[PDB]
């Protein structure tokens, strides 16, 4: 017989993702680069690896949508809800949805896709929101004045509690 694990996390270290569609705001290449950077955030702090697929069913299915887009978490136009992701599991588990009513960028203007993706992929891996206002996993997007992205201890401790 078998039983479910209590804590939601991936039991395999080699995970796949697929970009199902693309925002108009950035080139295919720029969108791909943002998501790869966002996954490297987590692979640098865990034994996890991420591989992009060009078709078929991946562990993490990434898509852009607006308002109602096929789940219980409709988007709300510009600002407010930027994105959401499902915790580890089969079916929709891991999937990440991005609101295409946002202005997506690779800069400090609008909403930085890499930064939002890095946060949402945290959710894809099993993290909940942080109560720490400086954490990656704090719920409210807060672009800081730092030159480079650095993962805070809060988020590192959270992800380590799941993946070691
Ligand atoms: C650890 C952390 C860092 C930053 C932040 N803001 C500017 N930076 C500098 C980076 C420079 C290189 C940029 C580059 O590589 O282009 C990406 C940003 N880092 C912002 C947040 C943050 O806003 N956290 C909460 C949050 C994030 C996303 C989200 F959707 C909802 C909440 N968290
Ligand atoms: Ca999935
Ligand atoms: Ca929104
Ligand atoms: Ca848009
Ligand atoms: Zn959704
Ligand atoms: Zn979140």
Q: What is the CATH number of the domain that holds 57?
A: 3.40.390.10
**Does 120 qualify as catalytic in the annotation?**
yes
Which residues form ligand 1's pocket by a CB distance below 6 Å?
82-83, 106, 112, 114-116, 119, 136, 138-144, 146, 148-149, 152
- The distance from CA 67 to its chain's CA centroid, rounded to whole angstroms, is 19
Closest by CA to 138, choosing from 148, 151, 147, 125, is 151
Q: What whole-number distance in Å separates Cα of residue 136 and Cα of residue 156?
A: 10
Domain count across the chain: 1
Tell me the structure's resolution in angstroms, rounded to a single decimal: 2.0
How many angstroms separate the CA atoms of 66 and 75, rounded? 6
Domain holding 9, by residue range, is 1-164
Nearest to 8 by CA among 128, 98, 121: 128
């Amino acid at each position: 017989y078998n039983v479910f694990p209590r804590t939601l996390k991936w039991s395999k270290m080699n995970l796949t993702y697929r970009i199902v569609n693309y925002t108009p705001d950035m080139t295919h290449s720029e969108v791909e680069k943002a998501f790869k950077k966002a996954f490297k955030v987590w692979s640098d702090v865990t034994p996890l690896n991420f591989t992009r697929l060009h078709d078929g069913i991946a562990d993490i299915m990434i898509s852009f949508g607006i308002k109602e887009h096929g789940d219980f978490y409709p988007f709300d136009g510009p600002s407010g809800l930027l994105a959401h992701a499902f915790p580890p599991g089969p079916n929709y588990g891991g999937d990440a949805h991005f609101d295409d009513d946002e202005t997506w960028t690779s800069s400090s203007k609008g909403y930085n896709l890499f930064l939002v993706a890095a946060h949402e992929f945290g959710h894809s891996l099993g993290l909940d929101h942080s109560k720490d206002p400086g954490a990656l996993m704090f719920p409210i997007y807060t672009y800081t004045g730092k030159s480079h992205f650095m993962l805070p201890d809060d988020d590192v401790q959270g992800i380590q509690s799941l993946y070691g």
